Amino acid sequence: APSRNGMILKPHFHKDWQRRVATWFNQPARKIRRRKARQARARRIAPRPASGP
Amino acid sequence: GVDIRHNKDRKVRRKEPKSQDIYLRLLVKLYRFLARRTNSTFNQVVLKRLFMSRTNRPPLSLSRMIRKMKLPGREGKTAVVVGTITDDVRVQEVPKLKVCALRVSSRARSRILKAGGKILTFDQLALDSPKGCGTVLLSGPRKGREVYRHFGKAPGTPHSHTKPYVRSKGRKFERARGRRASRGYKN
Amino acid sequence: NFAELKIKRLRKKFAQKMLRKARRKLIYEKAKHYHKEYRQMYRTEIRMARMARKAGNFYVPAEPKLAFVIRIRGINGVSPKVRKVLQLLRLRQIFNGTFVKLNKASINMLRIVEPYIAWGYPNLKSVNELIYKRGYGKINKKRIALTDNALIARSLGKYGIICMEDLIHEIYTVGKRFKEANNFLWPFKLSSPRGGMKKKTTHFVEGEDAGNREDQINRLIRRMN
Amino acid sequence: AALRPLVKPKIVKKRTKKFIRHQSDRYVKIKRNWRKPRGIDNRVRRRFKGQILMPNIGYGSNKKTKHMLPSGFRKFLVHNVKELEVLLMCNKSYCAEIAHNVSSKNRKAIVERAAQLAIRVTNPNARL
Amino acid sequence: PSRLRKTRKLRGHVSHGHGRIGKHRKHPGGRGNAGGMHHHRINFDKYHPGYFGKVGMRHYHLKRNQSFCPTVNLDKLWTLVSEQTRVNAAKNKTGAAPIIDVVRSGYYKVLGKGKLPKQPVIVKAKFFSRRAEEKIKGVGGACVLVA
Amino acid sequence: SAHLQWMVVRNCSSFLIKRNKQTYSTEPNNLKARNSFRYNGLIHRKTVGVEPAADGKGVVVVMKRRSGQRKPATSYVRTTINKNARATLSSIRHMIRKNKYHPDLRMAAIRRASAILRSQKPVMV
RNA sequence: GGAGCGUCGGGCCCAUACCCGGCCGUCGCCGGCAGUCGAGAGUGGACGGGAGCGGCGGGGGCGGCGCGCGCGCGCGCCCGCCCCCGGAGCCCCGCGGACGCUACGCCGCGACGAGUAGGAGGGCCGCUGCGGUGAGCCUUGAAGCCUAGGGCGCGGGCCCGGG
RNA sequence: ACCCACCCGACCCGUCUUGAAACACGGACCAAGGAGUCUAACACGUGCGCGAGUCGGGGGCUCGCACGAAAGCCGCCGUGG
RNA sequence: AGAGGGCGUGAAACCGUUAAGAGGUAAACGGGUGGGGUCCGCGCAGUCCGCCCGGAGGAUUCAACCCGGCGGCGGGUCCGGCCGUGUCGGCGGCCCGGCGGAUCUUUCCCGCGCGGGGGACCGUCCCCCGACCGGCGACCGGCCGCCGCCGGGCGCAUUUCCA
Ligand SMILES: [Mg+2]
Ligand SMILES: [Mg+2]
Ligand SMILES: [Mg+2]
Ligand SMILES: [Mg+2]
Ligand SMILES: [Mg+2]
Ligand SMILES: [Mg+2]
Ligand SMILES: [Mg+2]
Ligand SMILES: [Mg+2]
Ligand SMILES: [Mg+2]
Ligand SMILES: [Mg+2]
Ligand SMILES: [Mg+2]
Ligand SMILES: [Mg+2]
Ligand SMILES: [Mg+2]
Ligand SMILES: [Mg+2]
Ligand SMILES: [Mg+2]
Ligand SMILES: [Mg+2]
Ligand SMILES: [Mg+2]
Ligand SMILES: [Mg+2]
Ligand SMILES: [Mg+2]
Ligand SMILES: [Mg+2]
Ligand SMILES: [Mg+2]
Ligand SMILES: [Mg+2]
Ligand SMILES: [Mg+2]
Ligand SMILES: [Mg+2]
């Protein structure tokens, strides 16, 4: 029951969202994995530019 | 039994600043002493406006400071603001100033020190004029916040100009029944 | 330099002492003049009555301009208009007393709050007990005892009332400073009447203690003070 | 002779009995520690005649004699010898209190150091 | 900090700050924004006017790329260009008249709010306001279109 | 300066001691051991401290030098007074009086000095 | 010959009610204190000339704008000094200025103190874990538990003594 | 503070209620567990930084991660809100 | 084993025994006391001392005052030098300084109308002596006043400890 001058809100939490929460605790380890893969690619192509063509 | 209405026996004014910042507390101590010793009301107003909150001391703009200090009679005068001095980029020329404030932004400070003015703090203002002689005490726009556009008389009501709390403005979120004479009624 | 400052300090102390003795002599002579005026009034009322009785006449005395009002019923179960008039007359507790000057508005206010008060016309010795024994003034909104004439001389120095005798003379012979004197006087916190009340709930005519005690208020003042 | 305080006031106490909790006489699970009654119909809450009394602010002891021992001192809990020089300028009004967890080996050192510094200990003859 | 929340000061209080007569039930007036035309009608009239009804046309595939038109006023016009450009002004016996490229700064339409200082300009913008053009030609500048 | 670091130190110092309603302060050169702005020797430009001697006989008096801040090794100077105790009280009194060296600590340092004097003697029978 | 009824007179009994006094807390004081003479408050002092027991020739007003605990006081000899408080020695020290000052502290007056549903504030009340801190405590005895012991706090609870 | 004796007071706590000691309901006693939490959207008030600007989201560069999946930085310091 | 094979500590409800008290208005509670117990703090008088002063018993040294050395505080014409800020002078560093610019020059160079490096211009940060205002708690070396410490001269009406 809305009362005494708030916003007329529409929250999208009517589905089963707690089963589908995507927590992002992976992402600093994912930055480490992307860094290691990028350094491995740069060591693979040794005279070539590391970014690409 | 005595019939005192005890609803308003406790005055709800500020006695001390709610913040825990030690430079502001030292300025508060110095203006406490100046308020309960000096006979001037300037130190009391400075202490009362050092008591207030951040949304209660509004930022004062540089062009309004130029406007209020180019009034006649206040030559050789200083401008004491108990909030912050913010720069306006839409003013071109700036004269010599003597500005006392809690905090001046970097662009306004560079503009005043390039124009040749002086920027004092409150301890330097107390060392210069302890009774507050040669001062004009200014304050920024109090009703200038967006929060006051939603206050006062309620919307959905005739002769009211209150901004309603809308999550996103547009065509189909409002301006229908309650705002159109075609859809039932307008106000 | 130092001897000059010493002689200057002794001169200032002598100036304060001489001015204090002059104000003391002022208070003494004004109290003597008030004694003379009181004896004059008490003589001339009997003179008027005797010269009225000498012929076939009658001296109707004046309705006295000053009354003393005591709230005799407490705060529980009070009408709104009656409570408003009692808090305008500064009767907030049971057994409070105030000096009230008499006019049409005052008589009508007292007659519409008759059943909760006992009011009468007091006497000079009644004013003397109520001001010397119960002397409480309102200085900086504080109920401060009147242990010195300097308090009245600081509070009402711009009204001509600078001592206890000036205050008693204004209250008894109501003049142009009765409003300031009555606003200075805190409403008197009197004790319970020693010897018991006759009846609180009914009027003094029908055997009670409420209403108009226009001459018999002095015995109740002696019992409550 | 013993260690005398600086001034010896007459310690007056408005109430020396304990504010026990309601129905702690009846029930064992109800401790003696005070809990305020908050019921709609409670004798103790609405203060009927001849019952247990509620702890109000009116039972407050005098500020000159608050937290004061019957000897005339105020307690200060002391763990070691270094904490005894804290009360070096307060021995006429404050007294040392050796903690429970302090061993009997250094308790004698604390007692003799307080005897050298003229500081009263309320429990010197405990362990030995 | 649950140390400073309200549920610590309500230990011992029975109804926990939610009333003894009317208890804190689960959903007394419906879930969410329930009852638009009914039993919340006074709230939805005196605090959200225009909430019910259709108005205006419908533009189905709308995109902000076509309607992106950022606006700058003449009161903040010398802010987009560095300060030495207006230091080196009213000099050189020429009428130097610097160029202010507005699309380079990031705006498309130049509006006419505010006072403009007396210095000729060449304002290059995609769109202009009529009042802005009147202020620029009154100072002595020139409005140049660009696409 | 001094009031600034007092506003820092006044509640979150390591030498502060609560526990049973008295707030003391246990740093060196804090005579009377109060957590006050008068009785704090770490902060101020001028500092008087009174301590017992390490040998057991005499009283050492610690004077802050003023000749260098940011240098705690040479910030203080220590002297040792072992005399007939009237000259001890008079010497410390002259130290704090004639040198104009913060006279608020004067009589309290006399108190602490003569209490150390009564400490360094056989107390019982 | 009421301990009944009706009209009454003295004395007497007490409630958390009223008066006075003691204590606690709340609120108010343009509250006082970073250090001074000052209580109806209506000044101090260099600096040039004449020089003086004379001094401002103002309301039976009953009084403040003014007088006799000195203003030329005293000493050396008509003239000069009329001196500093490392100390005039004083109810006030304009010479630095606490025992009283965790200024988020201390202190001084005045009024008030009921309470459900509810709201706010302070907890040096209590539990658990963490970052700092106590040259912290401890097998010369930690936590826990019992106690007909000593206590403190209005209270939540806490500190010791014994096993 | 343990027990007993006397005088006066004194009906059993919580709840629904206009009204509870109730012939209204729950309740033998004791120990442990036990009930206003977390995310998002807002609104208002407060604390802080900057100020017609503000924020770095996301990503990238440095340390091999004890402390770390911390911290620091960015012609990305503004794509974007 | 006062840890004895479901055994670390072993609470409450409940039960048994011992000791004490009591008992016909069910038990229990609040206020005020009284009595009896278990323990605590004294005490063969606890009158507790902390200063100053007088007297009769004692006593080692030193203070009062000078000499030599060391350390500290305060400061003058600011004594001389560093240091330090506000202005003026050499626009001197500007190339024997980097950065940034939406101010010009492609009078230039390189990689091919563009990008970078040059050249002036502006803004931001520095070098040398001299003056004034605050010498500013950012430092010294001399000089003066004062204080403290060490070693001697200081023989006893001074000086300090026990009773
Ligand atoms: Mg890529
Ligand atoms: Mg109330
Ligand atoms: Mg209220
Ligand atoms: Mg009634
Ligand atoms: Mg009820
Ligand atoms: Mg409640
Ligand atoms: Mg409920
Ligand atoms: Mg609620
Ligand atoms: Mg409800
Ligand atoms: Mg119901
Ligand atoms: Mg109800
Ligand atoms: Mg019913
Ligand atoms: Mg009930
Ligand atoms: Mg029934
Ligand atoms: Mg039911
Ligand atoms: Mg049942
Ligand atoms: Mg539990
Ligand atoms: Mg809301
Ligand atoms: Mg906010
Ligand atoms: Mg958006
Ligand atoms: Mg075992
Ligand atoms: Mg085990
Ligand atoms: Mg084990
Ligand atoms: Mg076992």
Automatic annotation (TrEMBL), chain B:
Q: Which residues bind Mg(2+)?
A: 7
Localization annotation: Rough endoplasmic reticulum
Which spans are transmembrane here?
A: none
Q: Where is the composition biased (Basic residues)?
A: 160-170
| Chain spans, region Disordered | 151-187
Q: What residue stretches are annotated with the Large ribosomal subunit protein uL15/eL18 domain? A: 1-187
The question of whether Metal-binding is a record keyword is answered with yes
Annotated GO biological processes are: translation
The molecular function terms in GO held by this entry are: RNA binding; structural constituent of ribosome
Where does the UniProt entry say this protein principally localizes? endoplasmic reticulum
> Which first-to-last residue range defines the signal peptide?
none
Q: Which GO terms describe its cellular component?
A: cytosolic large ribosomal subunit; rough endoplasmic reticulum
Family under the similarity heading: Belongs to the eukaryotic ribosomal protein eL18 family.
Return the PANTHER family for the record. 60S RIBOSOMAL PROTEIN L18, LARGE RIBOSOMAL SUBUNIT PROTEIN EL18
Q: What is the designated name of this protein?
A: Large ribosomal subunit protein uL15/eL18 domain-containing protein
Name of the coding gene: LOC100350944
